[PDB]
Amino acid sequence: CDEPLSILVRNNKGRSSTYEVRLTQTVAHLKQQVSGLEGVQDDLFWLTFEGKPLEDQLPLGEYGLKPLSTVFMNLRLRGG
Amino acid sequence: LSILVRNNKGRSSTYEVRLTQTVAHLKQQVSGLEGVQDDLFWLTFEGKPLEDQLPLGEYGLKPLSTVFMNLRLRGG
Amino acid sequence: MASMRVVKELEDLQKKPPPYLRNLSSDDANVLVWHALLLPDQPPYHLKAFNLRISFPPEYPFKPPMIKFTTKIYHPNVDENGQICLPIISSENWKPSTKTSQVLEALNVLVNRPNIREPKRMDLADLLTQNPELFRKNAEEFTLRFGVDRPS
Amino acid sequence: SPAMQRIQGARVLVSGLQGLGAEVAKNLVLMGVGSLTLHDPHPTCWSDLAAQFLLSEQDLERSRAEASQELLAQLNRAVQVVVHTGDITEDLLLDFQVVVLTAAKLEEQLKVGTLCHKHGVCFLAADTRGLVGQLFCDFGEDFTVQDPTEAEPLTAAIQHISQGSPGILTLRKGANTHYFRDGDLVTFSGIEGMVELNDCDPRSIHVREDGSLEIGDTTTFSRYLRGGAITEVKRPKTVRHKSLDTALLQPHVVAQSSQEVHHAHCLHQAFCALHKFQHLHGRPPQPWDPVDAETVVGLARDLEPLKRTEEEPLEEPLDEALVRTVALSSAGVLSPMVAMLGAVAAQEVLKAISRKFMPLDQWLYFDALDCLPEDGELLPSPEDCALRGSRYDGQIAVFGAGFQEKLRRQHYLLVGAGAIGCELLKVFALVGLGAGNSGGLTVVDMDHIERSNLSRQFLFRSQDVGRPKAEVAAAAARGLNPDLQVIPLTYPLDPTTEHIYGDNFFSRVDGVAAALDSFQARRYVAARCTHYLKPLLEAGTSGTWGSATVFMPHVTEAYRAPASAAASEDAPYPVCTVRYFPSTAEHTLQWARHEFEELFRLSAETINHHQQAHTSLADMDEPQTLTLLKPVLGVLRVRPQNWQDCVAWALGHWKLCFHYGIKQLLRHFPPNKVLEDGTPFWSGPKQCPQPLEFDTNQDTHLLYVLAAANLYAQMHGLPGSQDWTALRELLKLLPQPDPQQMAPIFASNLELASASAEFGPEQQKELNKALEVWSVGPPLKPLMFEKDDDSNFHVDFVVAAASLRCQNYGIPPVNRAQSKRIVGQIIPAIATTTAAVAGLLGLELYKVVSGPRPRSAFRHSYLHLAENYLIRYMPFAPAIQTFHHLKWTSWDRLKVPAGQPERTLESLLAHLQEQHGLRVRILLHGSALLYAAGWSPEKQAQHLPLRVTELVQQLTGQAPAPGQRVLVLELSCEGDDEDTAFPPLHYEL
Ligand SMILES: *OP(=O)(O)OC[C@H]1O[C@@H](n2cnc3c(N)ncnc32)[C@H](O)[C@@H]1O
What we know:
Chain C: It catalyses: S-ubiquitinyl-[E1 ubiquitin-activating enzyme]-L-cysteine + [E2 ubiquitin-conjugating enzyme]-L-cysteine = [E1 ubiquitin-activating enzyme]-L-cysteine + S-ubiquitinyl-[E2 ubiquitin-conjugating enzyme]-L-cysteine. Chain C: Residues 1-148 form the UBC core domain. The complex is a heterotetramer, with two copies of chain A, one copy of chain C (152 residues) and one copy of chain D (989 residues). Chain A is of the alpha+beta class. In chain A, 15% of the residues lie in helices and 24% in strands. Chain A has one domain: Roll (Ubiquitin-like (UB roll)), CATH 3.10.20. Chain C has one domain: Ubiquitin Conjugating Enzyme, CATH 3.10.110.10. Helices cover 34% and strands 14% of the residues of chain C. Chain C has four helices and four strands; from the N terminus they run αββββααα. In chain C, β1 and β2 form a beta hairpin. Chain D is of the alpha/beta class. Chain D has five domains: 2-146 and 241-354, Rossmann fold; 155-233, Elongation Factor Tu (Ef-tu), domain 3 (Beta Barrel); 409-569 and 826-873, Rossmann fold (3-Layer(aba) Sandwich), CATH 3.40.50.720; 575-820, Ubiquitin-activating enzyme E1, SCCH domain (Arc Repressor Mutant, subunit A, Orthogonal Bundle); 881-988, Ubiquitin-activating enzyme E1, UFD domain (Structural Genomics Hypothetical 15.5 Kd Protein In mrcA-pckA Intergenic Region, Chain A, Roll). Helices cover 36% and strands 12% of the residues of chain D. In chain D, the strands form seven sheets. In chain D, strands 19-18-17-20-21-22-23-24 form an eight-stranded mixed β-sheet, with helices on both faces. Chain D has a seven-stranded antiparallel β-sheet with strand order 12-11-15-9-10-14-13. Chain D has a five-stranded mixed β-sheet with strand order 2-1-3-4-7, sandwiched between helices. Chains A and D meet through β4 and β5 of A and α6, α14, β21, β22 and α18 of D. Bound molecules: adenosine monophosphate. Adenosine monophosphate binds at residues 415-421, 444-447, 469, 492-494, 515-517, 521, 829 of chain D.
């Protein structure tokens, strides 16, 4: 898998931004990239794909990400 | 009859405060024996607000109770 | 818990104490407060020493430690009560990665080179900018009248 | 605001006011729908009391609509709830805007759906059959939404638009650089200067590399003076929905994956089979009856294959097991599932009414069959599920009487009684959690009910304001279920109250449900539950977001709080970075709040008490406060009695606090003439302060003036009322009162450069005697600041001050969302998402009560109603950490017995090193160090012989009270790192 793919990450405010990640990169790398881009601490949110959350230590290639695949970002909620 | 008092300044134990008199009159003695004004920090008795003109002895202070306080306001 | 990290940091720091810090110790009753002696290496502050207290909030390192100058120090960046405004300590720049050694280094730098941009005492900055010599006189007088016994 | 104007004028129709219809109607009434119309002429039975909270036992053999109308009307007095006892006709459906058919027959669904789609009326058809739901919404052929996303329009700061003809514009570097897109409309709200570009038509933009932003033709307009705020305009989207009789054949289901779509198709087939069975045999299938399940699955087998996607080949058949399981447990209606589906349906109704958010794309199926016993367990029998006239008949028809007894033996805990707490209390009361002589309940909450709370609350009435929240919630819960025993507690679950909620208290509880509003509270409650090994149910909502999680000990991963947010909750933001460098309007409002606190609160306790107690102006920072308080109003050599309704007492403060000071700092420290490091490089970073002209046409500056005047009149008892239409002429009659007091406001009394305390003892004595004179007067009680009173414009004062200061500093003004982001009328909760998370928590409670279940049975839920987003995923396994021989999880702990005689510290260390094979480098109880390997040998020889309890008593100064079962102290080891965390050591006494 020499060719990196471009995926879309959905912000909580309905906005999608194109990223550039490798399937060998762990979810920690993508989480740090989106944390830096969106200005949110990487421990305040978690990102999911196809209805199931993504673990930090596993590589993105385990979850079967296709090019132009939307990965949702879910915040941790405070009010109640 | 004793009341356990702990302060964030350092080591603290039972003070001269007695439940017979309101803490408003005890403000002078606690300020004299602490050296720091009560205006800096607000006392939180077991998660309950406290006021200078509010006698706390009628709110059910069990013997050998506890008192807590935290740093308040901005430093600057 | 913050206390584990604080004890580890203090134990590591005692092995190779910074040259400007000595007799740095914490009471076993509450290991979240540090007492240390600051030794500036730039006149007029080099005549005496300075004692400061480092207080770690319970949620360290996600909240910066609180630093207060227990002794009376004449400085534009230090209020009378002793609180200091370090760039690292401020929440807009604090990061959990920065250990307390960097904070102490920045404090020493700020003591040697004051942050004239944003002082906690405006009149001191005005006096320093308009007449540095009078500031030198007053600072020397204050550090002689209140300076703690400086060791060697 | 415009959306809420349509809701109050809308009219909806709810049919079949069973458990689901009652939930939908309650959510609609709480949200504020202007006029409902309940329609259900059937009498109340026993089978619907397990899910409907408006019908009691005494309401049997009575029409459900009429019985529910009383409680629904008393729920909110602004909603005109009426009951329609006739029959549904075309002229009736013409009037309403939305109709909802909850648990209505397929014939009625098709008839009403065709009639409503013919007349352009939004239609919803929700239905719950046991543990599987169904929602269908059809909003006409041409329905246009106006706010497609739950997000504010984008805002950015512009700095340079000099380049013209392609309309190149530059803006500050950040996320807003890439936030904007190409195919979007952008509207300039309005800035000082460039009247050509203000209030113009929206202009599409083009994003170019290196920050270039193409606006278009702007050279012919005015010259660019100063940058300002730029906002976005949302593009309305038109959505088309197929009619129900057409959408049955091609179900366009909402799902997150292909597997979920196939599951929803199978559920749709099962529901169609159930409807056909009820059409044939005239009765719903019997509870857990094998013959009726076989009949339903046979109907599904011969059901027309065209019900699925005709063009897509039937690669796999429908699940026989899924259809059979749905048929078996389809004879009951449950409170949690009703709550969840009614929340979703009411959200869809609000979407249709207010034309906000993206409407659900036709079908949505919710599967919650995991709450049934595992495949290896004993499923309920038909005789077990036999109805016996109890209020829980609908729940027994799904689970059985033994599960009801298991539910009622439980003794639970509910930390917090807010919105989610009240909804969970309703779910517990209806379900029957501890509604017996062996069980019970506990509600832990400290706060008191206020007006701003009960606006969208369920259990709180108008006359309950000021009473304890826990007590009122307990009374309401006892009212819902008479058998339920609720024990309200006022002491918060806080580390200062670990003596009340100790081992003796936590021994009785069987579980904990947390409905808290902060991350620190959640972290503490999760820590307590982990310490005592109790199941924990945690929920949290924000807007239309929502989560619902269960943390079973040794099963699912322990709670991991976002420590960054927990720390940021209590934020001592430094004033050192807000006095001169306001980055955003948040800094401006923070500074405004800080100055309000400094001037209106701290002055009361220092004007008299501080001077009369001790100290003076020499040994305290008093002179600055006295200088800012004494001459701002005016001495007049007499007692101050002037009314605040005057120009001088407000415009003088406005000019002093916002013009004189900034002018003084500009003339003292010019941005281009700062003497820093000899030669300045970046003096005046990104901001050049400049006071604005006194433009009386702008009414924003008068808002702050009137707010300050009214606040002073309220706090000092000065007369004042709503003279908005009477005092304007007087206010504008004195446009220039500044020169009349030039000398007092110039510099103290006599100063040129102020030298070094040039005022001297002569002025200090005058200041002291002025303070002594002013110290005589009526007492000023230190009344706490109340943000609930919006009528007196408290938050308006802060907002106006922030807006004027940010305009002074060239910062974009505060918007409505920015204002609501802070304690100035913080964002309230929404009834729909609260009910949804409470229903998911009840579904999890079913499994928690059911007993030993694997991790695969439990599910964590996360939903977003504004975009039809919902996920239910099994939680992660415990994170196993390793260190040599020792391996542990987040629940594991070390227990070491102290023995009949208390072991010494050396004995404890030897026992640890032998039993677990680890060498203790640091061992501390709480924040008191007990042993360190780096200690000098004399100190170790001093500490080791002492007993551990004796050592703790010597150090902390307090002996342990009787009942201290365990001393919990943490430890470290040699050769590890700071990443590892050893399990807490429970030193058993
Ligand atoms: O509706 P809501 O989201 O505001 O509910 C939160 C409720 O939780 C109470 N609360 C908050 N924190 C605690 C603690 N530590 N202990 C007990 N109750 C607590 C609030 O009263 C609030 O209503």
